[PDB]
Amino acid sequence: AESIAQPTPINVIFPDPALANAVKTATGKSNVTDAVTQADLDGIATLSAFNTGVTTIEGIQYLNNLIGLELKDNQITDLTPLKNLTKITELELSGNPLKNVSAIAGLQSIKTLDLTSTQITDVTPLAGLSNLQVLYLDLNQITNISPLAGLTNLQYLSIGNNQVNDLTPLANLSKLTTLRADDNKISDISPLASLPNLIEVHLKDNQISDVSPLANLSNLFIVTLT
């Protein structure tokens, strides 16, 4: 567990004013210049700073018991302060210019991960996130899904607006109920025949000729194509 040395002002620990403002609210303090103890930081379960101009998450390392982090539509480039967090289950980083997600590979506790529009090309760091249930990878430039093959707890996978051409890595994800994959380079959907719990399959703007692998899936509410 990580710990501040003494009582420190919130805007020293969290140099980003937007994130400072969110910790001020989460700790019940009056001003970002007010002091917090490590106990105040250890009582933050969830932190939300959606669309507030956050550019750095320095200070987050002290939030030992953080469970949910909602940081959609900010301008965060460095995820290093998250590295050693051990209880985060919900991480929402949609819209941030991440470029890669190497820094999250150790976050084994993550159940829900949103990496929509993060300018990523590669999901190799996700292979160790064995507890992942909900994954959004939409609006990136991802080609290879091989690193997801061991993510056997996945129920919801969204990979729309990428450059994916092979669904073979999805063959063992037997808990999947939703696959959203509009606007990719998919032509063979044979892998989906071994996914019996599929309810919703979105496959618009792909290059699919043969829908036989869907014929035996008995829980299917909708498949979409163009």
Side-chain angles (χ1 to χ4, degrees):
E2 203 137 8
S3 184
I4 59 169
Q6 79 285 51
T8 305
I10 296 161
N11 69 350
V12 170
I13 300 163
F14 298 90
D16 193 284
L19 197 61
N21 186 68
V23 175
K24 182 212 80 195
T25 302
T27 59
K29 299 290 175 175
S30 300
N31 203 300
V32 297
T33 55
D34 297 332
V36 290
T37 63
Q38 183 53 52
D40 296 295
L41 298 186
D42 285 338
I44 303 179
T46 58
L47 197 60
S48 78
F50 159 63
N51 195 33
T52 56
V54 176
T55 61
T56 175
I57 62 170
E58 177 57 31
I60 208 78
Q61 67 267 40
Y62 302 108
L63 310 184
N64 297 298
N65 303 321
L66 192 65
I67 288 168
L69 190 54
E70 299 177 337
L71 293 173
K72 173 172 191 196
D73 292 336
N74 286 301
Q75 297 81 45
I76 294 161
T77 59
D78 183 15
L79 299 180
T80 294
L82 299 178
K83 274 190 304 216
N84 300 328
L85 297 184
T86 61
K87 296 183 191 162
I88 184 163
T89 65
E90 178 244 275
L91 183 54
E92 296 175 34
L93 291 173
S94 169
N96 287 278
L98 305 175
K99 305 265 216 292
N100 71 87
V101 295
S102 298
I104 71 160
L107 305 185
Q108 190 170 15
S109 59
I110 295 178
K111 289 162 138 194
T112 298
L113 180 54
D114 189 350
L115 299 169
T116 304
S117 306
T118 56
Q119 306 176 28
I120 64 180
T121 64
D122 187 13
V123 292
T124 310
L126 311 192
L129 307 189
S130 59
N131 294 308
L132 206 42
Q133 292 181 346
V134 181
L135 183 54
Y136 309 85
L137 292 178
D138 305 276
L139 301 155
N140 288 302
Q141 300 179 24
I142 296 158
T143 54
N144 192 10
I145 302 184
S146 293
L148 311 187
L151 304 185
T152 58
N153 295 306
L154 279 171
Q155 298 179 36
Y156 187 104
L157 178 55
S158 194
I159 56 165
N161 300 277
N162 278 290
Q163 302 240 77
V164 172
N165 72 258
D166 197 344
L167 297 180
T168 302
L170 310 186
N172 213 355
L173 312 188
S174 61
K175 300 185 185 170
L176 278 180
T177 50
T178 302
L179 178 62
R180 287 183 174 188
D182 290 347
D183 193 355
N184 273 296
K185 300 280 163 52
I186 298 164
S187 53
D188 189 343
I189 61 162
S190 296
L192 307 190
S194 66
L195 304 180
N197 301 291
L198 281 171
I199 305 180
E200 171 173 295
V201 188
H202 285 188
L203 292 165
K204 298 175 67 154
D205 289 273
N206 280 288
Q207 300 94 65
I208 294 165
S209 293
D210 183 11
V211 295
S212 303
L214 308 180
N216 280 292
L217 299 180
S218 65
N219 302 298
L220 210 47
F221 180 76
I222 195 177
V223 185
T224 63
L225 296 167
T226 56

